[PDB]
Amino acid sequence: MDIWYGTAAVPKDLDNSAVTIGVFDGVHRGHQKLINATVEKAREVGAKAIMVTFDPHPVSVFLPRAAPLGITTLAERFALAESFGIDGVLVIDFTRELSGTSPEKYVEFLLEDTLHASHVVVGANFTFGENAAGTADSLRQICQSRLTVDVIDLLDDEGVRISSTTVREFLSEGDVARANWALGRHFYVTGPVVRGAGRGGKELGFPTANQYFHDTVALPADGVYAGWLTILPTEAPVSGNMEPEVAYAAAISVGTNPTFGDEQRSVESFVLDRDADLYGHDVKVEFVDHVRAMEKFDSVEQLLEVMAKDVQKTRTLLAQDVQAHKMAPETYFLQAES
Amino acid sequence: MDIWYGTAAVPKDLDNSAVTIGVFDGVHRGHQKLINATVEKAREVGAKAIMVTFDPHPVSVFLPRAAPLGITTLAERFALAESFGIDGVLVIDFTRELSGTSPEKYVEFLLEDTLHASHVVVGANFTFGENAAGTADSLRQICQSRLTVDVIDLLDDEGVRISSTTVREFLSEGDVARANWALGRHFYVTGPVVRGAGRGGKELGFPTANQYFHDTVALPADGVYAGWLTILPTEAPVSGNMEPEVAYAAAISVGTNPTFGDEQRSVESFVLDRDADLYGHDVKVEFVDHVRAMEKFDSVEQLLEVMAKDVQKTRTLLAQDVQAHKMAPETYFLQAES
Amino acid sequence: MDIWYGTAAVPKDLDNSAVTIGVFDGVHRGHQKLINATVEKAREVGAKAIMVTFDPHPVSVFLPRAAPLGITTLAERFALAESFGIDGVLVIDFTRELSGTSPEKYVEFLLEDTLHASHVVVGANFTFGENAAGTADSLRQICQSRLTVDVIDLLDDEGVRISSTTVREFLSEGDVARANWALGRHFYVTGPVVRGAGRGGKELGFPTANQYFHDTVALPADGVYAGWLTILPTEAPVSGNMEPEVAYAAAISVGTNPTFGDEQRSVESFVLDRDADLYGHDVKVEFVDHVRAMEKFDSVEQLLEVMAKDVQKTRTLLAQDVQAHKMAPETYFLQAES
Amino acid sequence: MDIWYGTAAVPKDLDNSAVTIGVFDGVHRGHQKLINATVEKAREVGAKAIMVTFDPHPVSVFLPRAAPLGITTLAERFALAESFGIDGVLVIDFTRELSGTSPEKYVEFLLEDTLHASHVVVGANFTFGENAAGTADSLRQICQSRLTVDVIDLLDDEGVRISSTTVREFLSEGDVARANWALGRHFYVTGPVVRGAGRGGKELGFPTANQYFHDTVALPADGVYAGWLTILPTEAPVSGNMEPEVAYAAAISVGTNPTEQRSVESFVLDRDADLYGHDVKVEFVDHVRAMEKFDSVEQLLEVMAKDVQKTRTLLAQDVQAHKMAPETYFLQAES
Amino acid sequence: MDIWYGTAAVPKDLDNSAVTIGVFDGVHRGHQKLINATVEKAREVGAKAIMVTFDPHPVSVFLPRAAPLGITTLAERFALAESFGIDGVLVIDFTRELSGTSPEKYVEFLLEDTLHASHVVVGANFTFGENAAGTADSLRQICQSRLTVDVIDLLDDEGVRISSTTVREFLSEGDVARANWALGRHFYVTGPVVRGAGRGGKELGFPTANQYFHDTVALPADGVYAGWLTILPTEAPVSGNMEPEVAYAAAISVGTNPTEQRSVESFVLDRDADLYGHDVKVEFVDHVRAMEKFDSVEQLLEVMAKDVQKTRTLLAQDVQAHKMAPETYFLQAES
Amino acid sequence: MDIWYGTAAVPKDLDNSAVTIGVFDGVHRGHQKLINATVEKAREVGAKAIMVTFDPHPVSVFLPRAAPLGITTLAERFALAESFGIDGVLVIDFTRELSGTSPEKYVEFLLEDTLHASHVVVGANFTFGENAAGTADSLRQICQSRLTVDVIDLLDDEGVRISSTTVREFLSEGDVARANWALGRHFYVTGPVVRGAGRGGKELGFPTANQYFHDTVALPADGVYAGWLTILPTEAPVSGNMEPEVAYAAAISVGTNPTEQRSVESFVLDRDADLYGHDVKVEFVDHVRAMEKFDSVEQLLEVMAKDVQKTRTLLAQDVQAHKMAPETYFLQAES
């Protein structure tokens, strides 16, 4: 999959494409409709399936700091776009171009001149051009006889509108199950593992892995979650008895340190039945279900007791998750008990 | 109008004065009674009307950081004092003088030796001297046969005591209309315009002007207000179609950035029907009415829609404000519609 | 009293001891049972009474930053241990030793090899060894025929469990009276006096003393308390009419400054009927009773009036405290009135 | 004078223009040659004189955290352009447009489509387009018989190249005399006066005015300088015996205070005033001495009386030579 | 290769081992002699080759805020150990164990009880036990007929002592050639690429990749260097014309930005790419020039074209001599 | 000894006094001449000896962020005044009073109305009143037949002017020997001991005591010094083999750690102790060596054993000459 930053970077010799346009934050089940429709049509006519997306978030152009939290990083957006069969991602920066352009010149410049589009696919909520004047309707009118438009209704399922907004609200509430339901996969973050307390190994209280994330990263509410931890492919040695590319049952504590801001979130994972230290490795953490809210501990005894209940509850939740195997990892490690 | 910092700076040859004494923060309608009475009496006997005020705030001398927010800056206090006909402002710093003095020596030193007063005007809540021992009553007793005292009752109107305290509560609540009512004018801040997002001009989402204020500045609660933006007299060129000294209809967003403190407040003004960038200019922003609370936006479309409703509501509120012309600006710009 | 940091620092020639083991934070009335039982038994057999305690807090080993607030500093723990007749304190750092040891090797290494114990005294909630496996029960089993164990039930009195946890909750609530009740003494902090506002002396609004404490220090909720201020023995001159080693009646304001963190707490003491400045001195502040919540002041007059009510209420509370003379200071200064 | 942010803000009905192009930081004597040629030309052929300038600095596009110090603010650049009779300033942001463009397109789009220029004026060092391919030469042909180019050599005078760089060098070493000579005027900063050390009045040690400036602002080296302070036009009252729009003799101490951040403290000669809240312009005439620490009141006051005598002399000299002296000023011969 | 944190993590059933002991920071040519002797020995006598190393640095135990810069991360130390055929790394933390121990106990506990070693290999400068009483000598006797000691002298070559210290010295002065010669390989750092100045593509001035490093990381002096950049194995897509696992010629600018903090910005020769989000390895070949400030686009681009020509030459040279050159690389002869 | 903050705190019934006036920072040998003359005089004529001093420093009134470093704290200044037999200290804050006053009024108000002085003692460099008009001369007349003035010349000894300035110079360069000679005693700091590197005990590398000081506190240059450490009187238990009120030989490392901030770390010779929570006084005797970085445990311990031998010698020397040595001390001849 190609990745182009700005119209100027798109190959001039590009001859034909089917194009979809959106922020696509989270690439949720609604987003997958647009992508699927686009990949289908590109296949039919032997064109390339192109996603036009936006970075920075279009909102943050007008309101820096008051931008929506990113359900996925841009990099993960790319990987997800690829995994659903996008051939090329064009990334538009509204501080560079396509901001003040009229709806007409937008179609002319982006869809025709830049992309050589024969088909365009948008959601019914799509807008474009200066002061968001252009709508799904405009696009259909301007594109008459020039290229075909397919406008897809927003996805409603089980009484919930599936959008980036709702996914963010679910995550913020700590309801990763409903977020996963809307995403069509386990919500996850990826990142390098750093040093924490310990000495991950024999000690049940020291995390198997510690990660930190900037405050633009959407993460579930502080608390403990059941999930899966996967060491990403690597040749580097692994301290302990965990193997790369296997999803390991884990109780996950999401926290907020600050006093400082960057209001930095931590993610601390206690991997069930394994003694490992993951420092320096790149690790994926998938969230499956909420287990409990955060609480303060006043003795090691109380703390470890609670830690043990987390593990028990996690084992239960994950044993269930494996049965919903469209969500579950291909290769996993979960012991029936301790 | 003269401005003197400390008793020592007052001209020795000053021969006669009518004096009023208070913090005078906000110079509200109650404060105007004291000032009016003082200016009247000074006119009668051909004396000078003197305001004795305090900086730093007397409270902050005992409780730094826990001082009341300043309804106006000291500089604006001066301008307002002048506008009601004060001839001289004496500024007392309680960390330098007049702090430990007995009520008797206070009258002797300040009113007689320093100011050569023949008339003094205070509010019924006035205190003075070490540990606030002296009252309106004391002042009348000590001044017997030495200079006349006029004690003015605190202003009650429509069931509300008009004081700095109540004005601050109204502002804090976001109720600028009642604050204006108590002030006897539109509450306003003044300050240099800096760079924000954009590029103020054709784009409706980029503010016409961005200003920042330190956290000692009283400002209304975060939200959107209808108000008027006036470029203060200047020879410097103005980017766009706004002229100096004209009050322009504006929707005003008051915000709080931090994470850092100084808990710095922002003020972002969207000037109705104008395309201008005000960087480097000195700008007055008068608040007229609350429009809505702050909210997070998840798409440019949603944001601009809301921005448009702000403008509609602002136009309505301001069209009304012009009719209460004792509050309204002399020269203004308000279009009937877009 | 000896103080040893780590097992290695304990004299090899130590021949016999009676040992108690716990965090002992606050040395509350429950803690005093363990200490009393231990000192008694050590007296009987002519052994030394040894406290084994922990620093850092065992919780913070697993959860740094999320550690319980310290009811007393380590130094005060030592002084209190001494005052109840402990001969030696052994301080264990769980990041250095005794963390991963089995229950069996813990008894063998710590109680026998290191301490030459003939008697050990723990609370029924005691745990030890890797992953807190060992309990009061384990200890009794492992120690069979090797040294005697005495397990003391947790202290319940007036329907309240007396533990570090409950003391912390009382303090956090601002209920120092119940905290004192559980501690068996007035809760107190000690620290150097620094400069504040003023000029402690004739001015009633300037504190007699200002102290700051780091955010790991447990302190009552922000507000005003009645208490006693004692200048610790010193040869350094004292500005004003307070003498060293006398407990002086004081109204105490506990505050939180930040914006910055270290979320630093202040303690400002207004000593009744005295004019003194305590800069540079080391001062103990004992808390006796809650007087009022914190509030913002908008005039010096209002502030001083409230200050006067604080003093009146304090005089009342302290006059009562003197009658409960098991709590009260040996040598005190309290005037019947102003 | 109009100010346009980006090509899109330019009036579509712009008939005809004479254009000059550059960063124009400082608007020094070399810059003034370009503007003069442009203004003289435009007034002749009926047309508007346009300056195309850049913000942020083209260097800062590639080297954030490594951009040259602003000799003047962008606001002062506008004011200086207007004073030399420019009719419109077009401000180009290289992160938005005109950056990755070819030389060929840059000309047609900017000079032709946007500005409809008959005449362009650039300095011999002018570069443009993608990776700065376009040069003083590129320009003269690419504009064949459409618009009349005019290249002006960089200014040498007294063996010295006059450029933004040399001005920045002169300032950096505290040689304000040479900076001014290159600028064609007193170097100045403008800013709101805040509270600082004590209160301005009878005391010689408390500054008449205190100002702070961000670290993007070029200031002379830390030290004391002779200069003039002006209260900008205002109806706000002035505490003390100073009125607006008169340049008052002052000794000026420039200090650094990390964490930015530069300070400017003005001791106005023979005045008792406190200028808190006013906007104030401070012009630098000549360097007086380096910064130094003090450990007694006597010593500090002694040196400050020397600063004052030194300032009187240097400023009296500035009044003769006359060319850069203020129109209305206040300078006493004696204390 | 196994990694054990503390003596307690070592498999109790560890039959027999050949052990080497040291900080091993940088795993330089002197270090490689120790590992070689250890690995060759262990493969012979059926046994496992073990490295005992230290984290945190033994100096940092006594001098926090004053610890020497890490030539490599602990993670890279593991990777280097494994590449030279070490079977297990035992990481000792002196704040937890082995610190206040006598020389006598250190041997029995670590080499005997924990590691069950028949053979130990240390450098002639080896010290241990309480207050470093134990030395190269202490070791040879205390291990009498139990385990066969083997002391190796520090490496001198070309009149130069090869040690972590001299490597740190070479890096500090920007002499990467000498650092590499002492290391037996190109010095490198590895890190996630973040966003920085602009976007990597057609523009020569926007870096292909931007990385920041904490102040514990040894980096060469601020300046420009010739080097190779490798995208580490990945299935993530790559924006632009670069694939993973090929070393691409690059000019590398190393910068400092307080408050830590070092930056590494790579301008990959003859490529248009943006490597945001990828893990990237940057090897340093030779110093090109010191850091310098710029005040025009032309100037900055001019110097950067010089950096590129200079890099081509130096890297072509690195391809001959051959011994440290990358296996798979990309280097064009001409622009 | 009484302490009065401001003229208003002085007992109205103050009958008669001999007064000395100055900053008195450090209370050095020059200062001691003033106090001696004042104390000897007052004990004679039945009266109280008064010191008028200043806080904040008179320089800091005009130059905030530029005030000279305190040779001692204000608290230590009180303690030193008392030790030389001053009966009352009057602390004047120039932001509150006595600042913009004329010379004439300063005398009548301070010396006459407030202090009711018969005798004043100042140094030949004394200045006062508005803009320091009043001088050693001004004083002798303005006090005509009311109160007997007495001016004392600044102390020269061994070709050296003894002043707060020269003391600050001596400290700054790390020459504590000369500072002490000028002070008439060992320079010292006093402070609460906190936790730092490791735990104080058997290990030579972990300091017996760790202290930090704000940047207003004058400390010797970064380096190692020979000195004495005293635990101030206390009933709090002491971990280890040290008792209060005995000066123990120590090697003292002074460090800087931005962002203030100075550190003082004491390695007490031949003791195993940890002094956390105690108030501790540290006296500086002689400079031993400059600061230096370490990169091995052996090296660091080696140098520290040298520091110890060096300290023993220097401190044994301090015990002879005798004049500044502590009354009760602990210094072993050998390890």
Side-chain angles (χ1 to χ4, degrees), chain C residues 188-201:
Chain C
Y188 64 91
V189 288
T190 319
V193 181
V194 298
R195 299 335 211 128
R199 269 32 70 203

Side-chain angles (χ1 to χ4, degrees), chain C residues 2 4 6-15 48 113-116:
Chain C
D2 296 294
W4 307 292
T7 52
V10 180
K12 291 183 158 190
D13 83 322
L14 180 73
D15 81 315
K48 273 166 57 76
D113 300 349
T114 304
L115 297 171
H116 312 250

Side-chain angles (χ1 to χ4, degrees), chain F residues 39-82:
Chain F
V39 166
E40 288 154 16
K41 176 59 64 194
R43 224 321 199 105
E44 273 174 20
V45 304
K48 268 164 77 93
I50 309 293
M51 175 195 282
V52 177
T53 190
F54 311 95
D55 193 57
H57 197 291
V59 156
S60 79
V61 173
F62 307 100
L63 282 179
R65 307 163 190 281
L69 304 168
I71 296 162
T72 69
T73 60
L74 187 60
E76 282 311 301
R77 197 193 303 173
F78 295 151
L80 288 166
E82 175 189 80

Side-chain angles (χ1 to χ4, degrees), chain C residues 1-5 8 55 73-76 78-79 82 93 192 195 199-200 233 235-240 277 279-280 282, chain F residues 1-5 55 73-76 78-79 82 93 192 195 199-200 202 233 235-240 274 276-277 279:
Chain C
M1 189 184 82
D2 296 294
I3 300 165
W4 307 292
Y5 288 92
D55 196 57
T73 57
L74 192 63
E76 286 308 307
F78 299 155
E82 194 185 39
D93 182 337
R195 299 335 211 128
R199 269 32 70 203
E235 285 312 308
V238 176
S239 186
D277 180 294
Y279 148 78
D282 233 79
Chain F
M1 186 190 82
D2 302 310
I3 298 162
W4 306 302
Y5 287 95
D55 193 57
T73 60
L74 187 60
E76 282 311 301
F78 295 151
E82 175 189 80
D93 178 338
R195 311 208 153 283
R199 286 291 172 274
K202 299 253 87 278
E235 297 297 314
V238 176
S239 179
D274 177 295
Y276 148 79
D279 244 77

Side-chain angles (χ1 to χ4, degrees), chain E residues 57-59 61-68 94 99-100 125-127 130-132 135 165 168, chain F residues 196-198 202-207 212 257 265 292-301 304:
Chain E
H57 197 291
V59 156
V61 173
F62 307 100
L63 282 179
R65 307 163 190 281
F94 280 136
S99 203
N125 64 316
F126 179 54
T127 52
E130 199 164 54
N131 301 291
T135 61
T165 299
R168 290 192 195 98
Chain F
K202 299 253 87 278
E203 254 79 283
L204 271 196
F206 294 135
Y212 309 89
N257 204 237
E265 303 167 6
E292 62 209 56
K293 327 157 184 304
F294 305 92
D295 43 18
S296 77
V297 159
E298 176 186 55
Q299 182 188 100
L300 166 67
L301 291 185
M304 283 185 166

Side-chain angles (χ1 to χ4, degrees), chain B residues 1-5 8 55 73-76 78-79 82 93 192 195 199-200 233 235-240 277 279-280 282, chain D residues 1-5 55 73-76 78-79 82 93 192 195 199-200 202 233 235-240 274 276-277 279:
Chain B
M1 189 184 82
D2 296 294
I3 300 165
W4 307 292
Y5 288 92
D55 196 57
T73 57
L74 192 63
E76 286 308 307
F78 299 155
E82 194 185 39
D93 182 337
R195 299 335 211 128
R199 269 32 70 203
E235 285 312 308
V238 176
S239 186
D277 180 294
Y279 148 78
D282 233 79
Chain D
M1 186 190 82
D2 302 310
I3 298 162
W4 306 302
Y5 287 95
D55 193 57
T73 60
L74 187 60
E76 282 311 301
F78 295 151
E82 175 189 80
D93 178 338
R195 311 208 153 283
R199 286 291 172 274
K202 299 253 87 278
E235 297 297 314
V238 176
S239 179
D274 177 295
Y276 148 79
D279 244 77

Side-chain angles (χ1 to χ4, degrees), chain F residues 256-269:
Chain F
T256 306
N257 204 237
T259 177
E260 272 78 300
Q261 161 136 323
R262 315 292 306 283
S263 62
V264 171
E265 303 167 6
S266 295
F267 307 87
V268 173
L269 270 60

Side-chain angles (χ1 to χ4, degrees), chain E residues 161-224:
Chain E
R161 166 67 39 79
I162 287 159
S163 78
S164 293
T165 299
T166 63
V167 176
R168 290 192 195 98
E169 285 166 9
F170 288 152
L171 286 170
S172 197
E173 316 161 333
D175 191 353
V176 297
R178 287 277 90 186
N180 294 352
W181 160 86
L183 284 165
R185 72 175 185 275
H186 294 148
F187 174 82
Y188 63 88
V189 288
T190 271
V193 178
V194 303
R195 311 208 153 283
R199 286 291 172 274
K202 299 253 87 278
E203 254 79 283
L204 271 196
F206 294 135
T208 315
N210 285 268
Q211 299 161 292
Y212 309 89
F213 295 93
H214 303 132
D215 62 4
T216 52
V217 176
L219 278 174
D222 284 350
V224 175

